[PDB]
Amino acid sequence: RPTVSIYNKDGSVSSETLALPFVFKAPIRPDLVRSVHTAVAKNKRQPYAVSEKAGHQTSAESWGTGRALARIPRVGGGGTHRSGQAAFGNMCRSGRMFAPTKTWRKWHVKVNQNEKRYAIASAVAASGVPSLLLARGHRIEEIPEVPLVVDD
Amino acid sequence: QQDEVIWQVVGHEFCSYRIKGEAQNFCRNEYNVTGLCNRQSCPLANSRYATVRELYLYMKTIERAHFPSKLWQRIKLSKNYAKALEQIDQQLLYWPGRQIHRCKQRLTRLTQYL
Amino acid sequence: MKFSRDVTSSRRKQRKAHFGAPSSVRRVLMSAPLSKELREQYKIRSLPVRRDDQITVIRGSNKGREGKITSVYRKKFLLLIERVTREKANGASAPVGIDASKVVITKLHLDKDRKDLIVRKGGKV
Amino acid sequence: RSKPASENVYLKLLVKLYRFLARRTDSRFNKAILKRLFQSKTNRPPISISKIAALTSRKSASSQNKTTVVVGTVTDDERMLTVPKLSIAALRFTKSARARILKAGGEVLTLDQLALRAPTGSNTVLVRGKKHARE
Amino acid sequence: YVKTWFNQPGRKLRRRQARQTKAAKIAPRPVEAIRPAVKPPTIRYNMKVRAGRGFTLEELKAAGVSRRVASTIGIPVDHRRRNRSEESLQRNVERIKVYLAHLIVFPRKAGQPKKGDATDVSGAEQTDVAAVLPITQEAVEEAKPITEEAKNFNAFSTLSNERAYARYAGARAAFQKKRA
Amino acid sequence: DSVFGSTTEVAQLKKNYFLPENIISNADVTRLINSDEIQSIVKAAGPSRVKR
Amino acid sequence: PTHVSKTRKLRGHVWRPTVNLDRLWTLLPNEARDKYLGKNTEVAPVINVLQSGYGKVLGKGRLPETPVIVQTRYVSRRAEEKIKQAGGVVELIA
Amino acid sequence: PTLVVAKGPNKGLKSRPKGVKGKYKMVDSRMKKDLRAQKRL
RNA sequence: AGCUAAAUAUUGGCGAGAGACCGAUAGCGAACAAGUAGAGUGAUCGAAAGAUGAAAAGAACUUUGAAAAGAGAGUUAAAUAGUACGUGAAAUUGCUGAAAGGGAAGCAUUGGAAAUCAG
RNA sequence: UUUCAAUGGCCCGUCUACACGGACCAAGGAGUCUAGCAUCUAUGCGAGUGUUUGGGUGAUGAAAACCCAUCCGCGAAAUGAAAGUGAAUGCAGGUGGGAACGCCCUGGCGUGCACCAUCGACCGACCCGGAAGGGUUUGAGU
RNA sequence: CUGCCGAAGGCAGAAACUCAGAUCAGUUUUAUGUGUAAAAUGAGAGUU
RNA sequence: GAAGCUCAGACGAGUAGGCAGGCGUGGAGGUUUGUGACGAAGCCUUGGGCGUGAGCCUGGGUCGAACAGCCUCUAGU
RNA sequence: AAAACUUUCAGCAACGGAUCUCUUGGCUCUCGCAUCGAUGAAGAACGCAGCGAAAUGCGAUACGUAAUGUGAAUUG
Known part of the structure; x- marks a missing residue:
């Protein structure tokens, strides 16, 4: 197996070396890694939803037919600015939105353990390749060795 | 791992030197010979x-x-535009001759810059 | 980065606490640094701002002006300095306000309470 | 169809290789491999190591050193208690099947090694797993 | 009505802290009590062994520890369970014996180890029971030589006979009682 | 090595885990396609981009 | 993903498990198969399908001539003399 | 009932119209399109 | 006849920490003097409304005017920030300039005329 | 860009020509989330497969991630109303076609995947016999 | 927004594989009486 | 950009319906030594340019503090 | 056949408050806690500041007193 040298705190190269771990030969699979990362990244999300009573706690019933105006329910009463205005509708101002967001949306997603381990092994193998690091954007032009190993 | 798997992860889409636009992409690599995306x-x-x-x-x-x-x-190389052409082409004779013309032309354009 | 859970990082809560802090908290918020000679004399980096302190402006349109403080106008996080005023339209003097953190204290107003503060905050008299 | 539905980079490389082999040789075997590389998993059933051993040692047999080729997964069959000396080149081997093949008998190969050894398909038996098996 | 599980990590953390608080409060003694080895009561699970609620009075007496002090030293007692076979009896008896052998009791009033206590108690340490008393499963039979009389013995032929005997048991049960 | 294991021996810190096997082993198709074993079998190469 | 749905382009368009004897040797670990199968030992290996989660053993497959003791509750009719012709005995467990 | 049309000063009513007593129905000329559908149905 | 912690629930109350949430016709009805103004005999119904500037430094003084205001000034980086105050769209309106017009107007194709830009 | 000249041009949507909506503008505004089932595709493993009910570790934010464990779910066996019984005879059966391959010397020869036509056996439920043997009945069976 | 395929008064398309065929035809000849059978021309034809 | 290059021929109405590729909006992860008080976003414009199109870039004016390309993710698009 | 009028285009000025940016607000999730009252509760009323109408606080000791901590203000 290939061996990688150990670099000390002073930037030198020590005599001790490590044989290359098998994981650095793992199949680099960008599509599988992206799909697993897509799923895993959603497991830290917090639920959000509008108030379940939002748009309902008013009082408004339809005025009827033949009124020369739309049949959307309108707030009752009088003397106030809100009286006569429509309610109970996604189109209506201060009305409930269409399909109010709920908390029991599927926020978390299950990933097979073997698929997760496949992605992690490929990620480590990808980290052990210089060209992938340059595409990643890391300024490693003068890094002495990849993979980089430092003493204890 | 290898040249081709690096290409299919990096070269096609993912690279810090890709500049995609309406229908074209260019290469900012300080290592590229043509400035375009190619094997x-x-x-x-x-x-x-x-x-x-x-x-x-x-x-x-x-x-x-x-x-x-x-x-x-x-x-x-800091001698001459013509001279630089000899060092570039001489050191690429024993090397794959496909990109000698592109490298030479880069020398000519960049000397024109100077 | 913060690692506790008793402290907050929300912009909403920090601004609410800052602009709603009572006068006792605005005293600490309205702190100023010390001059180099003062810092090397009391081993103190910063001190709260108090009236009748001799300060010098470091930033703003009054950069370099020097004088004593006539009032620490706390409810706007503001200081008022002698002669650092503005000519109004009629010609009267309207005091120009300077933030407490933009000035440097060049001479203190020493009393027993402030000396207690100096010795308590890891300093020497 | 001219491309697989998968995004797998290594499947693309295998498609690239056998696309050249099919279009630059007269191997109807290579054309078959390219077609079976484009087929989906429902059209690529797994073949058991028991079935491969049976097909090699079938009747007149003449298995000899003929390489067994399947475009799919060589699943293992625990039911037989011995494994003959076999040589199978396939897309994917299960760990049990690969270990049983290597420990007791011959060797496993990828379709790459198949293209290296028998690029035209000479002395290669092209097996396929059982279809239907609907549940 | 919907029951959402957004507090699952919160519940898990709270339970772990409660275990941690319990361990800190009663550190001298293990956080889990000794439990007896007990076999599930059905034909589907009678081949396994699990942890019962507590020991029985017969097991406690056979071990030599009284039911009164058993609770004090940390041995749960079940007054409902009964031992219908010695195999379970000495099984739970030896569980208690190994527990007592590994058990150290701090003397009360710190004056002297009155009868049952420990002379040296400085080696106190909180350890879980499972380490000292790892509950096991039913012993899996190892290879045995071929038995000749068993070899001659057919097998399910008998199960067919005692089955037919069982189904028609009432048939001959009538037959004898009516003719006698 | 003890964390991820190999393709043949189990990882010590992950029970019943083996490194996944690869679909294609020597996946450098370009050298493989230019290797002698294929150039020797392929028919005479057809012309590239042609005159109209 | 809503972005790849159809409406984003419609916009504007209005109790007894059983085992067969072919799998009996699978129940024993790899070590037991290596140290008992294919050789002649005075002591015979024992298979306890009950501890593996099987109530009855049925009769699909063949067996190697290595004798083996099968512990089970119920056993299939000619599967018995499949063991006997294989050299083993079915000892019934209660 | 007595029929009337809601036009001009007869728009925007919540209850009994102006100058109307007894059983009443008012039309707005828009329900003709869904009344002709009911006639077909 | 009876008692009893724990694991369990918790759109209220009290504290906190957050967010792939909303960003003033949205988000609680309410970011604001909001269950307020206001309506109904009553049970009840119930809004609208955020932003000058870093600092009022919120336009001294003069002139015309009954005053309101305007015009000169003055503050400011900015008054194209003057409280009817960030930015300031459309509908609609006034003025200026260009052009057309005999019961429609709109639009398209080709080209002239005037204006304008470009190689 | 405006405008003129010649030519052409009925007001858009809805509903079965009519009729219904439309004074103008800005903002908002309508196939969403979720439970089950089905087809297809992709990924991982493969006679197995599924960590997140639970436990441990995680200090740098710890609702994430990582690790660990027995049940258990589906599958590995079907049939019978039910008790129940509960699968390679014959290379895990043969015949023909059949992809691909090999052999020569186009064709022939082998060779036969999958699959399809056949085909015998076996598991049963039905019938006769007292397990053997006989049906040309049957099951999205080996 | 654009492109392609495109009806209906059991269709059009998709996938899985046959044969380089005498395999089909909103057709015409030949023979027997609009039916059937066996030359012309066109088309790659198909099956679940 | 093998996801490419190259040669040739035929073809082009389109409702129901089926398939495919793109433009634009809010937010998230990665990247661009990314843009910005020497002026970000927005807005106006008889200026210029690109695309069949959805749309995009840009000159001038106004304006005052944030904003965008590329690859994925996501939706109160 | 010029003006006026109508219409179109452009600049400016109006009308209006969209867009952009912001935000001591809202919403959602999680964690922690258990505390009203006849010793007068929740709620309502009426008052209290040098100049206060509302909001907040308080109760004839009235935008509060006592005690503890801070240490030099409040602000129009």
Whole structure:
């Protein structure tokens, strides 16, 4: 197996070396890694939803037919600015939105353990390749060795 | 891992030197020979190539490609535009002759810059 | 980065606490640094701002002006300095306000309470 | 169809290789491999190591050193208690099947090694797993 | 009505802290009591062994520890369970014996180890029971030589006979009682 | 090595885990397609981009 | 993903498990198969399908001539003399 | 009932119209389109 | 006849920490003097409304005017920030300039005329 | 860009020509979330497969991630109303076609995947016999 | 927004594989009386 | 950009319906030594340019503090 | 056949408050806690500041007193 040298705190190269771990030969699979990362990244999300009573706690019933105006329910009463205005509708101002967001949306997603381990092994193998690091954007032009190993 | 898998992850889409637009993409790589996305021109995605910048010339080979610090070797030319053409083409005779013309032309344009 | 859970990082809560802090908290918020000679004399980096302190402006349109403080106008996080005023339209003097953190205290107003503060905050008299 | 539905980079490389082999040789075997590389998993059933051993040692047999080729997964069959000396080149081997093949008998190969050894398909038996098996 | 599980990590953390608080409060003694080895009561699970609620009075007496002090030293007692076979009896008896052998009791009033206590108690340490008393499963039979009379013995032929005997048991049960 | 294991021996810190096997082993198709074993079998190469 | 749905382009368009004897040797670990199968030992290996989660053993497959003791509750009719012709005995467990 | 049309000063009513007593129905000329559908149905 | 912690629930109350949430016709009805103004005999119904500037430094003084205001000034980086105050769209309106017009107007194709830009 | 000249041009949507909506503008505004089932595709493993009910570790934010464990779910066996019984005879059966391959010397020869036509056996439920043997009945069976 | 395929008064398309065929035809000849059978021309034809 | 290059021929109405590729909006992860008080976003414009199109870039004016390309993710698009 | 009028285009000025940016607000999730009252509760009323109408606080000791901590203000 290939061996990688150990670099000390002073930037030198020590005599001790490590044989290359098998994981650095793992199949680099960008599509599988992206799909697993897509799923895993959603497991830290917090639920959000509008108030379940939002748009309902008013009082408004339809005025009827033949009124020369739309049949959307309108707030009752009088003397106030809100009286006569429509309610109970996604189109209506201060009305409930269409399909109010709920908390029991599927926020978390299950990933097979073997698929997760496949992605992690490929990620480590990808980290052990210089060209992938340059595409990643890391300024490693003068890094002495990849993979980089430092003493204890 | 290898040249082609590096290409299919890096060269096609993912690279810090890709500039996509309406229907085209360009190469900011300080190592590329043509400035375009190709198997013939990407040194990340293929073995030993050579390139010129402002004039210092990068050269590569495979046996020490695992060591990034000494991976890219630099030779400096500060004599003449015509002279530089001889060093560039002489050091690419024994090397794949496809990109000698592109490298020479880069020398000519960049000397025109100077 | 913060690692506790008793402290907050929300912009909403920090601004609410800052602009709603009572006068006792605005006293600490309205702190100023010390001059180099003062810092090397009391081993103190910063001190709260108090009236009748001799300060010098470091930033703003009054950069370089020097004088004593006539009032620490706390409810706007503001200081008022002698002679650092503005000519109004009629010609009267309207005091120009300077933030407490933009000035440097060049001479203190020493009393027993402030000396207690100096010795308590890891300093020497 | 001219491309697989998968995004797998290594499947693309295998498609690339046998696309050249099919279009630059006269191997109807290579054309068959390219077609079976484009087929989906429902059209690529797994073949058991028991079925491969039976097909090799079938009747007149003449298995000899003929390489067994399947475009799919070589699943293992625990039901037989011995494994003959076999040589199978396939897309994917299960760990049990690969270990049983290597420990007791011959060797496993990828379709790459198949293209290296028998690029035209000479002395290669092209097996396929049982279809239907609907549940 | 919907029951959402957004507090699952919160519940898990709270339970762990409660275990941690319990351990800190009663550190001298293990956080889990000794439990007896007990076999599930059905034909589907009678081949396994699990942890019962507590020991029985017969097991406690056979071990030599009284039911009164058993609770004090940390041995749960079940007054409902009864031992219908010695195999379970000495099984739970030896569980208690190994527990007592590994058990150290701090003397009360710190004056002297009155009868049952420990002379040296400086080696106190909180350890879980499972380490000292790892509950096991039913012993899996190892290879045995071929038995000749068993070899002659057919097998399910008998199960067919005692089955037919069982189904028609009432048939001959009538037959004898009516003719006698 | 003890964390991820190999393709043949189990990882010590992950029970019943082996490194996944690869679909294609020597996946450098370009050298493989230019290797002698294929150039020797392929028919005479057809012309590239042609005159109209 | 809503972005790849159809409406984003419609916009504007209005109790007894059983085992067969072919799998009996699978129940024993790899070590037991290596140290008992294919050789002649005075002591015979024992298979306890009950501890593996099987109530009855049925009769699909063949057996190697290595004798083996099968512990089970119920056994299939000619599967018995499949063991006997294989050299083993089915000892019934209660 | 007595029929009337809601036009001009007869728009925007919540209850009994102006100058109307007894059983009443008012039309707005828009329900003709869904009344002709009911006639077909 | 009886008692009893724990694991369990918790759109209220009291504290906190957050967010792939909303960003003033949205988000609680309410970011604001909001269950307020206001309506109904009553049970009840119930809004609208955020932003000058870093600092009022909120336009001294003069002139015309009954005053309101305007015009000169003055503050400011900015008054194209003057409280009817960030930015300031459309509908609609006034003025200026260019052009057309005999019961429609709109639009398209080709080209002239005037204006304008470009290689 | 405006405008003129010649030519052409019925007001858009809805509903079965009519009729219904439309004074103008800005902002908002309508196939969403979720439970089950089905087809297809992709990924991982493969006679197995599924960590997140639970436990441990995680200090740098710890609702994430990582690790660990027995049940258990589906599958590995079907049939019978039910008790129940509960699968390679014959290379895990043969015949023909059949992809691909090999052999020569186009064709022939082998060779036969999958699959399809056949085909015998076996598991049963039905019938006769007292397990053997006989049906040309049957099951999205080996 | 654009492109392609495109009806209906059991269709059009998708996938899985036959044969380089005498395999089909909104057709015409030949023979027997609009039916059937066996030359012309066109088309790659198909099956679940 | 093998996801490419190259040669040739035929073809072009389109409702129901089926398939495919793109433009634009809010937010998230990665990247661009990314843009910005020497002026970000927005807005106006008889200026210029690109695309069949959805749309995009840009000159001038106004304006005052944030904003965008590329690859994925996501939706109160 | 010029003006006026009508219409179109452009600049400016109006009308209006969209867009952009912001935000001591809202919403959602999680964690922690258990505390009203006849010793007068929740709620309502009426008052209290040098100049206060509302909001907040308080109760004839009235935008509060006592005690503890801070240490030099409040602000129109």
